[PDB]
Amino acid sequence: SPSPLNPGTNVARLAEQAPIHWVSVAQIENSLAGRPPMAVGFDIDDTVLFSSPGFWRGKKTFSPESEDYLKNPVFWEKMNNGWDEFSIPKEVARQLIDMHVRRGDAIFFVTGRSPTKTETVSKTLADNFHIPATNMNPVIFAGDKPGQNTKSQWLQDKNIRIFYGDSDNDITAARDVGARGIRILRASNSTYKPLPQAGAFGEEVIVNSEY
Amino acid sequence: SPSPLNPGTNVARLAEQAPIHWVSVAQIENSLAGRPPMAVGFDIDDTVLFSSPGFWRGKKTFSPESEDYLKNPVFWEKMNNGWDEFSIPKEVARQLIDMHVRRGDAIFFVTGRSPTKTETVSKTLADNFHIPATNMNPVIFAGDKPGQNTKSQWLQDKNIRIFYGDSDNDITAARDVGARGIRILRASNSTYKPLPQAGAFGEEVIVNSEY
Amino acid sequence: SPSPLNPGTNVARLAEQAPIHWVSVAQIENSLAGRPPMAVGFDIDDTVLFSSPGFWRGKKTFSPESEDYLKNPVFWEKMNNGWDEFSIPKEVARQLIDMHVRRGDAIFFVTGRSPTKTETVSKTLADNFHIPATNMNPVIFAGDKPGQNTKSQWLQDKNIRIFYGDSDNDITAARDVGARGIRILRASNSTYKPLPQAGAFGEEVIVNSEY
Amino acid sequence: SPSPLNPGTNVARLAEQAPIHWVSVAQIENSLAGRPPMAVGFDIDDTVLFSSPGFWRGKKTFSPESEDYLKNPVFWEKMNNGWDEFSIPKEVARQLIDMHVRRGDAIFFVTGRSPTKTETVSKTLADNFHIPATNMNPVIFAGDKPGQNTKSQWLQDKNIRIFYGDSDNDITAARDVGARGIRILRASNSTYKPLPQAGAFGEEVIVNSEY
Ligand SMILES: Nc1ncnc2c1ncn2[C@H]1O[C@@H](CO)[C@H](O)[C@@H]1O
Ligand SMILES: Nc1ncnc2c1ncn2[C@H]1O[C@@H](CO)[C@H](O)[C@@H]1O
Ligand SMILES: [Au+3]
Ligand SMILES: [Au+3]
Numbered sequence: 001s002p003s004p005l006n007p008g009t010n011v012a013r014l015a016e017q018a019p020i021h022w023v024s025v026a027q028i029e030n031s032l033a034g035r036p037p038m039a040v041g042f043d044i045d046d047t048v049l050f051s052s053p054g055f056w057r058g059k060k061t062f063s064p065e066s067e068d069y070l071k072n073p074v075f076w077e078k079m080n081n082g083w084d085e086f087s088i089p090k091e092v093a094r095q096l097i098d099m100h101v102r103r104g105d106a107i108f109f110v111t112g113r114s115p116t117k118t119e120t121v122s123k124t125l126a127d128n129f130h131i132p133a134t135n136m137n138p139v140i141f142a143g144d145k146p147g148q149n150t151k152s153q154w155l156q157d158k159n160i161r162i163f164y165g166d167s168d169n170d171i172t173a174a175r176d177v178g179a180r181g182i183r184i185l186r187a188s189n190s191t192y193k194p195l196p197q198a199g200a201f202g203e204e205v206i207v208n209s210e211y
Numbered sequence: 212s213p214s215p216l217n218p219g220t221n222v223a224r225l226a227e228q229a230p231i232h233w234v235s236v237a238q239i240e241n242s243l244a245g246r247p248p249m250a251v252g253f254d255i256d257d258t259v260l261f262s263s264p265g266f267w268r269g270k271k272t273f274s275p276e277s278e279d280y281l282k283n284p285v286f287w288e289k290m291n292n293g294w295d296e297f298s299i300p301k302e303v304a305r306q307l308i309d310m311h312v313r314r315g316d317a318i319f320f321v322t323g324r325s326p327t328k329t330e331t332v333s334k335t336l337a338d339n340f341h342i343p344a345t346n347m348n349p350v351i352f353a354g355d356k357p358g359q360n361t362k363s364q365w366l367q368d369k370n371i372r373i374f375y376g377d378s379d380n381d382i383t384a385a386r387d388v389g390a391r392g393i394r395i396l397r398a399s400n401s402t403y404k405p406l407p408q409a410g411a412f413g414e415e416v417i418v419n420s421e422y
Numbered sequence: 423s424p425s426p427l428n429p430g431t432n433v434a435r436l437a438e439q440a441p442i443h444w445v446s447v448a449q450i451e452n453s454l455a456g457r458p459p460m461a462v463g464f465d466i467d468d469t470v471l472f473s474s475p476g477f478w479r480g481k482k483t484f485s486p487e488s489e490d491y492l493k494n495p496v497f498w499e500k501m502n503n504g505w506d507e508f509s510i511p512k513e514v515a516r517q518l519i520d521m522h523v524r525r526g527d528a529i530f531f532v533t534g535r536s537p538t539k540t541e542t543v544s545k546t547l548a549d550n551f552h553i554p555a556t557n558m559n560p561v562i563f564a565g566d567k568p569g570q571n572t573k574s575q576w577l578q579d580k581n582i583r584i585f586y587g588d589s590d591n592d593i594t595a596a597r598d599v600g601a602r603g604i605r606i607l608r609a610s611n612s613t614y615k616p617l618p619q620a621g622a623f624g625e626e627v628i629v630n631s632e633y
Numbered sequence: 634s635p636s637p638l639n640p641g642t643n644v645a646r647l648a649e650q651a652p653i654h655w656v657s658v659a660q661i662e663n664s665l666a667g668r669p670p671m672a673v674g675f676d677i678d679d680t681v682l683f684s685s686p687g688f689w690r691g692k693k694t695f696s697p698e699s700e701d702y703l704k705n706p707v708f709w710e711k712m713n714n715g716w717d718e719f720s721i722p723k724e725v726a727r728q729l730i731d732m733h734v735r736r737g738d739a740i741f742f743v744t745g746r747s748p749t750k751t752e753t754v755s756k757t758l759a760d761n762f763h764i765p766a767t768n769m770n771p772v773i774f775a776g777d778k779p780g781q782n783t784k785s786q787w788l789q790d791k792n793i794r795i796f797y798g799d800s801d802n803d804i805t806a807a808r809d810v811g812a813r814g815i816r817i818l819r820a821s822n823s824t825y826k827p828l829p830q831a832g833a834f835g836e837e838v839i840v841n842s843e844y
C-alpha cells in the first residue's frame with residue numbers, strides 16, 4: 001500500500017499468467033484412454049457441491065461470530081440430512097462424474113464433514129449427478145476421531161487412483177498415497193475463506209472449475 | 212459441443228480486454244463527494260444476495276422440469292419468508308451499503324420477486340448488512356411481468372438517483388428515469404443463466420463484484 | 423516474498439479487474455459523432471510507433487550502461503533521420519488515425535524527442551499511416567530547452583482537443599489544458615521501462631492498444 | 634469487420650482459462666535438477682530476439698507488397714550481418730540462457746533463417762545474453778523449406794534434449810527427435826502473424842514469455 005484510487009495497470013500485468021498445469025476434463029479423459037476401470041474419489045465441498053448456503057446458515061444459526069458450528073453435532077445433523085437441497089452442484093463435477101461413469105469407474109466421495117447417525121448426502125449426490133448405483137458408493141466421512149480413518153487411509157483402502165478436490169489436504173492426501181491429485185477451483189463466493197492457492201503443489205488444476 | 216483438446220492461446224488473447232467502464236466502490240464514493248444525502252436503490256438477487264440456493268431448491272420442489280415455480284405463490288411465500296437464510300451476502304454489497312450509510316443516503320431494495328402476504332427479506336438484509344433503521348427502507352417487491360420493466364416506476368416514485376443491479380432490466384430501469392445505473396457481476400455459479408453481458412449499455416461495472 | 427516455485431492462484435485473482443475506464447476506438451468515434459472537425463494530437467513513441475529498436479540500437483551504440491544516449495545529439499540525428507524505418511507501427515494507431523482522417527480532423531504529433539536539424543519522422547508517419555497532407559502536420563518536437571515550448575503549450579497553441587499517449591506526462595499535458603487525454607498501452611517488450619500505470623489518473627485507456 | 638459497440642463481458646469469461654501446461658524458468662530448472670550438462674537449443678526469432686524490426690525493414694525495402702524478401706539473398710545478408718542491432722533481446726531468453734549456463738549446458742541456436750556467406754548473429758547473441766565461450770555454439774542456419782521441418786535433423790545431430798521456440802515447427806522438431814519442446818509466446822507486436830497457438834500440442838508454455 002498505497003492502494004490508489006486509480007491504480008491503473010500495464011500489459012505485462014494484463015497478460016501475466018501464474019505457472020499452473022491447467023487441464024480440461026477432455027484432457028484428463030484422453031490421459032485415461034485404454035486404462036481399465038478404476039476407483040476414483042471426490043471431495044464434496046466446493047468440489048462437486050457449492051454447499052456454502054448450508055454452512056452459512058449453520059454459522060448464522062449456531063455460532064454467528066466464530067467457526068464453532070463446525071464442531072456442533074446439531075449443525076451436522078442438519079447439514080448432512082437435507083441442507084444440501086440448497087447446495088448448488090458444480091458443472092465441472094457433472095462433467096467429471098459423467099466421464100468416469102462412461103469409463104465404468106468406481107466413484108467414491110470422501111469428505112471431512114463430521115459423521116452423523118444418518119445422512120442423505122449419498123442420495124443427493126447420486127441423484128443430482130445421475131450416478132448409477134453400480135458406480136456409486138456411500139459417502140465416506142473421513143477424519144481423526146475414534147472409529148474414523150483419515151482421507152489418506154481411505155484412498156489407500158479403496159485403491160483410489162485419482163482424487164479431485166479444492167483444498168490443499170485433498171491434494172496432499174492423494175500425493176501421500178501415490179494417487180493423482182487434481183485440483184478444483186473454490187468459487188470466490190464460497191464462505192470457506194481464504195481461497196486455496198490452486199496449483200500450490202505443482203498439481204493439475206481444472207480450467208473453469210469454479211462453477 | 213466438442214472443442215479442441217489442446218486449443219492453446221496467444222498473448223493477444225491473454226491480454227485482451229473488453230471496453231468496459233470498470234469502477235471501484237472508492238471511485239463511486241469519490242464521484243459523489245460533496246453530494247448531500249439522496250435515495251439510492253439495489254436489486255436483490257445476485258446483486259446483494261447470492262440467492263440461487265432458494266431458487267434452485269424451489270425449482271426442484273415446485274417445478275423440476277420447468278420454470279413454473281417462478282409463478283407459484285407457494286414458492287414465493289417460502290422464498291420471501293426464510294429461504295434467504297441460505298442466501299450468501301455479497302462482499303461488494305457490504306462495501307456499497309457501508310459507503311451509502313457513510314453518505315447518509317436512503318437505501319431502497321427494488322426486487323423483481325413477487326409480493327407475498329409477509330416477507331422476512333427486509334429483516335435478513337438489514338441484519339446481514341448492518342443497516343441502520345434510518346437508512347433502511349422496507350423491500351419494494353415490484354414483481355415480474357415480461358414485456359414490462361416493473362422497477363422503473365418505483366425508482367421514479369422513490370427519487371432513486373443511483374441503481375445497482377446485475378441484470379439488463381436493472382440498468383434499463385435506471386436509464387428510464389435518468390438515474391445512474393451501475394452493474395454488479397452475476398456469479399458464475401448462479402443458477403440464473405445465461406450470465407448477463409455486464410457493460411452492454413456502456414454503464415459502469417463494479418470490479419470484482421461477483422462475490 | 424516468498425515467490426514460490428508453485429505459486430498457484432485462485433478464481434478471485436483470475437477474474438480480478440483493475441478499475442479502469444477502458445474504451446475502444448469504436449466508442450471514441452461514437453463519442454465524437456456530430457462534433458465538427460477538430461485538432462487531435464498523438465505522442466509518437468509507444469503510442470503510434472514501437473520505436474524501441476532504434477532506442478535499443480542507440481543505447482547499445484552510444485551509452486551501453488546508462489541512458490546518456492537520450493541526450494546525445496549524434497543519437498538523435500540517427501533516430502530522427504531513418505532509424506524509424508525499423509520502428510513497428512501500432513495497429514491501434516492505424517485505427518485511430520484512419521478514423522480521425524475520416525472525420526476530417528487535423529492530426530498533430532507532439533514528441534519529447536530532441537529536435538534535429540532535419541527529420542524524416544513526419545514522412546515515416548504520413549507514409550505508414552496513409553495520412554493525407556491536408557490532415558498531416560509536421561512533427562512538433564516539444565520541451566524545455568531554449569527555443570522550445572512544452573507539450574502543454576503546444577496543445578494549447580494548436581487547440582488540440584484529444585491527446586493520445588502512453589506516458590503519464592502525455593495524459594497530464596492534456597489535463598493541464600482541458601483536453602481529453604487518452605491512454606495507449608506501452609508494449610511489454612518496450613525498452614522504456616518500467617511500464618506506466620495506464621489509467622493512473624482515471625483517464626480512458628484503449629483496449630488492446632499494446633500492438 | 635464490425636463488432637458491438639459495448640459488448641460487455643461476464644465473470645465466466647473474465648476467469649476463463651485455456652488448458653495450458655504453463656511453466657516457469659524456475660520450474661524448468663527444478664525439473665532438471667541433478668541432470669548433468671546436456672545440449673539444449675533455442676529458435677532465434679520471437680524466442681530470444683524480437684527481430685521484427687529487421688524483417689519489417691526488409692519487407693519495405695525488398696518486397697513492399699509480398700513476402701519475396703524472405704527468399705532474397707540480399708535481404709539475408711543484411712538481416713544476418715547487422716540488422717539484429719535493432720533486434721530486442723527477450724527477458725525470458727536472458728533467464729533461460731542464464732539458467733542453462735548455470736547448468737553447464739551446451740547452448741545451440743537453430744534458426745529457420747537462410748544461411749549467408751557471413752553472419753554476425755552468433756556474436757550479437759553471445760554478447761547480448763552474456764554467453765560464455767564454453768556454452769556458446771555458432772548459430773545453425775537451417776533455412777526454410779515449406780513442406781519440410783529443417784530443424785529436426787539438427788536437433789538429432791547435436792543431441793539437443795530441450796528445444797525452445799515460438800512456432801509450431803519448433804515444437805514439432807523437438808517432438809520428431811523425442812526432445813522436450815517448450816513454447817515461448819510470440820509478442821503481439823511481432824510482424825510475423827498470425828500468432829501461433831502456444832500450447833496447441835499439449836507442450837509446456839513459459840509464462841510471461843512475450844517479453
Ligand atoms: N465456511 C464453509 N463453507 C462451506 N463449506 C465448509 C466451510 N467450512 C468448512 N467447510 C467444509 O469443508 C470440510 C473440510 O474439512 C469441512 O469439514 C466442512 O464440511
Ligand atoms: N528506452 C526507450 N525505448 C523507446 N523509446 C524511448 C526510450 N526512452 C525514451 N524514449 C522516448 O520517449 C520520449 C519521451 O520523452 C523520449 O524523448 C524518447 O524519445
Ligand atoms: Au509437472
Ligand atoms: Au470517470
Ligand SMILES: [Au+]
Nearest residue numbers: 281323355403
Ligand atoms: Au428471475
Ligand SMILES: [Au+]
Nearest residue numbers: 703745777825
Ligand atoms: Au519466417
Ligand SMILES: [Mg+2]
Nearest residue numbers: 043045046166
Ligand atoms: Mg472441499
Ligand SMILES: [Mg+2]
Nearest residue numbers: 254256257377
Ligand atoms: Mg438481480
Ligand SMILES: [Mg+2]
Nearest residue numbers: 465467468588
Ligand atoms: Mg510515448
Ligand SMILES: [Mg+2]
Nearest residue numbers: 676678679799
Ligand atoms: Mg521463432
